[PDB]
Structures are given as C-alpha cells and as structure tokens.
Design a protein around this ligand. Sequence first.
Ligand SMILES: COC(=O)Nc1ccc2c(c1)NC(=O)C[C@@H](C)/C=C/C[C@H](NC(=O)c1c(F)cc(C)cc1F)c1nc-2c(Cl)[nH]1
Length: 238
Amino acid sequence: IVGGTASVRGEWPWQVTLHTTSPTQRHLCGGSIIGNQWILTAAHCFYGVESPKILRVYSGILNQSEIKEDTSFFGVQEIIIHDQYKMAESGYDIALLKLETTVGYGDSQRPICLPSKGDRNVIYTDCWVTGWGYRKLRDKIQNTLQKAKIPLVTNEECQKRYRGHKITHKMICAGYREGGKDACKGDSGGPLSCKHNEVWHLVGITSWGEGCAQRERPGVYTNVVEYVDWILEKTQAV
Ligand SMILES: COC(=O)Nc1ccc2c(c1)NC(=O)C[C@@H](C)/C=C/C[C@H](NC(=O)c1c(F)cc(C)cc1F)c1nc-2c(Cl)[nH]1
C-alpha cells in the first residue's frame, strides 16, 4: 500500500495473507474470507503454482512477524480459477481457495459480505484497499497490515486513464487523480472493502495498475458484484 497507515488489530478481519512454501516460505498475495471454508483472491496469484499443497492461509494476522513455523494456518484443498481467466489486464482475475478445514469465526477473523446484485447501482464513498505490499515501487513486504481510503473511479474515467487497455464493467477502478494512495506489489488478491449502511462489502479484488499510486493511473480491481453468481456457483454447488 502506497500512502497508507498501519491498521489496528481486528480492523479488517476478512483480510488474509496467502503464503507459498516453494522454494522457501513467503507472503504471496492477499485474500478475503467470504465463507467458513472459502477465500476470495486474484487468479494471477497462482501463476506457476502447480499444487495447492504449497499454499498456507493465515487469518487473524496484523503483523507478518506473528507468522513462525508454530503459527497455525489453513491448508488449501482446491484452487478454483475462473475459466475465462487469461491474465489480470484482460479481467476474470478471480479465484476461490477451498480450505481443508473450517475457519472458526471470531473478532480476529470473520467474513466480509459480498455486494448485492441490487447494489450495482449504489455509489460507494467509503472504500479501503488493504495489504502487506510495498509502500513504494522498490521496497519490501510490510510487517503491519497497511490501509488506504481510496475513491472509486467510473469506468469511463478509468478507460481514459488506460489508453491501450479495454477497461470492462467486470473491472472497477479506484485512485486519486494526483496519485499518492494505492495498492502496490504484494497487495494483489486482497480486498477493496467499502462500508455502506454500516456494513462492509467486498467491492473489489486488488488486481493490477501501471506502476503504483501514479497520477492518472487508478488501481484496477476485479468488480466483485459482477461475479456473485460465479462465486455462488462454485461455493453452493450441490
Ligand atoms: C518476502 O515476501 C515477499 O517479498 N513477497 C512478495 C512481494 C511482492 C509480490 C509478491 C510477493 N507476489 C508475487 O510476486 C506473486 C505474483 C503472482 C503477483 C504479481 C503481481 C502483484 N502485483 C501487485 O500486488 C499490484 C497490484 F495488485 C496492484 C497495483 C496497482 C500494483 C501492484 F504491484 C505483485 N505481487 C508482488 C509483486 Cl513484485 N507484484
């Protein structure tokens, strides 16, 4: 996160750190708890991941330093990548992780609501991008979960900013015209959480951008509202 501040413990209890153990253990991506055995993240996160056996999901984490060999985690039973996903810049950058065990809900870890299909008309004014990613282009993963309030940008306005790209309605952008506040390296897969009527909604999944927090380059996110039926298809399967 560029231009953010440290989060308080329990501030984003749906936020997870997804680690890979190959070759050595390290933070890979962010993610969101959306159900007791489900993590919603970006599909680009699994480039080169051949097995879910190398993945560890950590919930209830404020600081990366809370993670040691003795720290409990959730194994991943299955990686579900959207069928139409080719690359982040083309969209369909969405994946579900099916956990081997059930998450026990508490004040440190609980799910975020998905947006309502009746809420694609609502204008979200209180949006936050969270993650342990870099604070500048050449940096390291942050210890403490960072947060930044970012305004949502219309598709028309985001498409002007990305001449050469096709910004679809399955993408949602956010950023200040002058930059300074955004997602950066290591934040991908994490949530874009918007508070509406005192309830947090998972509006986006951190996907891509041109650099980090640049003027007239809003961060591009997976527009979660457009995938509610796909999420339900995969999570509510008979
Ligand atoms: C000690 O542990 C570490 O150092 N781990 C660590 C550090 C950095 C990154 C990691 C893991 N993940 C990966 O390399 C996984 C791959 C498959 C993801 C690539 C795209 C992703 N990109 C982003 O996070 C991203 C955005 F989502 C939006 C915007 C606007 C800008 C961005 F850079 C991104 N994440 C990182 C980097 Cl360089 N680029």
